[model samples]
Target chain A: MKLSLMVAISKNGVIGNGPDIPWSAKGEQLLFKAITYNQWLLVGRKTFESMGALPNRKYAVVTRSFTSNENVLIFPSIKDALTNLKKITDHVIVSGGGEIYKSLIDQVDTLHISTIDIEPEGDVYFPEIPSNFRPVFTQDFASNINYSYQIWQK
Target chain B: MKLSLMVAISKNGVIGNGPDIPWSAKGEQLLFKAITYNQWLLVGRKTFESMGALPNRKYAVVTRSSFTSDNENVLIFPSIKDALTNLKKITDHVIVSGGGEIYKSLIDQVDTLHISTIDIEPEGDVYFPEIPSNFRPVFTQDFASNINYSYQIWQKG
Candidate 1:
């Protein structure tokens, strides 16, 4: 299965602040919800916990703990998570909090990114978009601040 | 008096790498020359030494080393604060073209940012500081060259 990584990045590269998102950009959030609705998602344990549960979405969480349910599956590593997810579907969206993205960035085939104009201070940072990927789509949106959505592919 | 910062940044925020810029974007360099033509420039010692000297443009370099110049247009100050404080009195507009550390120290004091965003992620050691929230893009123009480059003018609120 091909992995599509998603993120909302700031001008300074910050993606999270502890367990929280640092900026308040409603339009960017709305776009994210729309894109991931009813989809199977791969997430890091902390990021999954921070988000709790969203309606109509199934989660494959990567963590050290062993947890399983009808809607959620926890794997000890990203390798096991991707391997099982590949058996079930042809595509999966990888949502992140920093560490997860950093680990899986090179394996991702597509990037769904929202570039926010504001620069906020945060501890967790999104890794730089690697040079191999090229932008295929971009749409501007205005929430509390200006942001642009882009679809990039390798 | 207004302080304008000029830089050619990569998508990953890299600016330079030890007395050298990592990438070659000729169009971005052309844009830099066109905009800074004949202007008084504030630069760090390393960047000034790397470029040696350019025609028409005057330089007010920040340096701590025991070096002095007899050139009519070249001036040296001990610190960024000293250079800005002295240069503001003589020139109404001054462009701060830097070598990373100087950019980080002076970014908060700058009123405008003339940034050329090059669409490549190369390995580099020096980086431009994040643009503060107070500054927003006022204008952007995309250049279709061998390498993609976009010029953006960001102004402080």
Candidate 2:
């Protein structure tokens, strides 16, 4: 099963400024929904709380605190979540909250990066793409904020 | 008169690792040479030392200590303001190539930014400042190399 990471970054590599995303780029979310539809999403607890339950999707939420419900399973760590999720699915997409991406960056098999044209102040950031991966596909999107999308593989 | 900042930055906001750049991408230097051709370059003392000298260019090297240059093309100043004051007398544009602190000190005064955003994130200590909302990207193009980079021209409004 492939472990993929999906994130939206600024031209300056900012992922989030505070609790909320720093920029409002139109249509970025629609594309996010299209790509993430029905996938087994592995995410941090804070990210799961902010992005509640979505239809037709199961979640492997990583948190030290105990929490769970139908369609959502809580694990103590990313390793625990990945170890158990691998048993149930063919793939798991790691949706981020900065710390999550930093932790799993080395193990990811695929990367989906959306480069938002605007550069804003950010406290949290997506880590840099390492050289071992090569970009396989790239496209320019002319949304309200203007962004470029690229897919990379190891 | 326009003051511009030119920098090569990693996707993770790093500009310099220590005294040297952490990553090198193919053809990146060619692009730099093309854009900065014959332009008056403003740099900190460290940057000037590392880059030494280039042809067809004049330099305003900012430093605190006294330093002397034998050639007409090189001039030393005690501060960024003093450098700009002297540079303005000869040219209408000053392209600031940085070493972290220089960029941070002069970013607010700059009217344009030519940013080369490299794809790889390597370990580094120095970083380019965040691009504030007042500046917007007027041109952006991606270059393919061993490591990919996007060049962006941002103009302040």
Candidate 3:
């Protein structure tokens, strides 16, 4: 199965402060809507809680505790989550929370990065990309949200 | 005349580590070239020494030492006051590229800053002036992968 990660980073490389992002740019929404429409999304428990839920796709939430609701499958570990995911998952989208992003950093095949132009302050950060990866394509978009929509592959 | 400070900083908001900038990211260099192509660039002694001269743009370097060089692109002035006096004869907006001392001296009256914050955090010695909320983020361009870097333009009211 193919693995991809989706994230929007601050000028400071921060993905989130706590459960959610610091800025209010809808480019994040635009990028999310374009991809992962009906795909299996692997997310951290905190990020799942922050997003509430979506009806189109199934969410495999990574958490140690009892984390369940309609359309949510809780798992204690990433490997266990993927074992369940291996059943119907031809491809998966590894979604965020700093820990979740880092956990699958080395495993993902492609990364959809929304490089937000606004320089807002934040605490939580995306892990630094190791040297093995390189950007495949980069396009600038300005729709009330100035950002570089980049795709990177290892 | 409009004063604009152009600096490349790490995520930690540091401008320099000692006599040099912390990281040598190429992305900010590309961005700096795009903006200061035909414009006037201002600098301090150390910053001038770090980079001798560029071909197209003119440089007004602030140095106590009489830094006269064979490079015709550079013009030396005694103090920042002397540099400002010379800048008065030039364009509408001047790009003040720095070493920390020059940035502090000119930051208050500065109207725009072309700041590029790299994604990595490095140990640093000198720092940028506190970027008050008045300086707004207007544009950005991101580049590379492992050491991802971005160019951010902040404009002041």
Candidate 4:
């Protein structure tokens, strides 16, 4: 078992502004569901807070500040989170907010990214995968709006 | 324009495993591509590095160290990178591996969640959206691998 991170990104790398997506594309919502169906989800406090609250899943919220919640298992550092993950399984998904993605990029083994074609005007963005990792699969979708789901392995 | 954070999660909120997805469902991949087109994507540095590099788009790498890269825009922070967006003019799509959804829900005026139902294991191991979020426009799809797609919406519900 290896650690992998999955995310759907637009052509502009904008994840969200406040609590929701910025565009009116059904495709974006579909892609998000496809990648995260069954696995452990790791995220930051801000990311968790923005969504309000969730139930029925095992959530690990990474944060320096400890907050007790029945739905969440909190950790202070990325390294410690990864260490804790080791106790359960060999792989873990590091979900984002700008800071969480940056901290865990070095340790993740594979990245599942949905690359949108349209440029959304916004301030937030997704980082590009390094060229060395190698693109193993590229699934291009031909719809009213064109996009591709690419997976990379290191 | 509202900010939306979308990602495929299981009944247990599991997103992924090693380098590959825990389950092999083609519809899930297609759905992911369909939803994320023409929007902005936000992710962490590990997600970026895991993919090896970035692609042709405007991207911000959330990190603590201020580093420069030609692949895309890099910003270091301990939390969600702040990108002042015009919610009225530009519809921003916020895609995350996990935590970003919290932020997306807070800023979004309307909530639309597309869920894929794979009925092999269901024991309430993970948490998903319940009835309080206003289950509107429920659309279902029966694709290959016994994977069904369900779409719901929550607007001031």
Highest-lDDT candidate: 1
lDDT of each: 0.80, 0.79, 0.75, 0.54
Which residue pairs overlap in candidate 3's backbone? Answer: none
Measured on C-alpha atoms, candidate 2 has an lDDT of 0.79
The 10-residue segment of model 2 chain A with minimum total lDDT is A29-38
Which is superior by lDDT, 2 or 4? 2
For candidate 2, lDDT tens digit of each residue in A1-154? 7888889999988898777789988656654664455568888888888778887567899998656668898999888888899898877888988999999898998787889999898789887678899875454555568777667778
Give the Å error, residue B91, model 3.
2.3
Kindly give the stretch of ten consecutive residues in candidate 3 chain B with the minimal lDDT sum: B138-147
Q: Which stretch of 10 consecutive residues in model 4 chain B shows the poorest summed lDDT?
A: B83-92
Give model 3's DockQ, 2 decimals.
Answer: 0.02
DockQ for each numbered candidate: 0.01, 0.01, 0.02, 0.18
Compose the digit string of candidate 4's lDDT tens values, residues A1-154.
4666766677678866665555554454455454444445688888778764444345678877657656567888877777787797545666676667777777678787766666766666666566667655454554455667666778
Q: Write the per-residue lDDT of candidate 4 for residues B23-68, one digit (tens) a residue.
A: 5554455554555454444555555555434332234445565554
**Interface RMSD of the predictions, in order shown?**
18.3, 16.9, 14.1, 9.8
Regions more than 4 Å wrong, model 3: A1-154
Q: Clash number for every model?
A: 0, 0, 0, 73
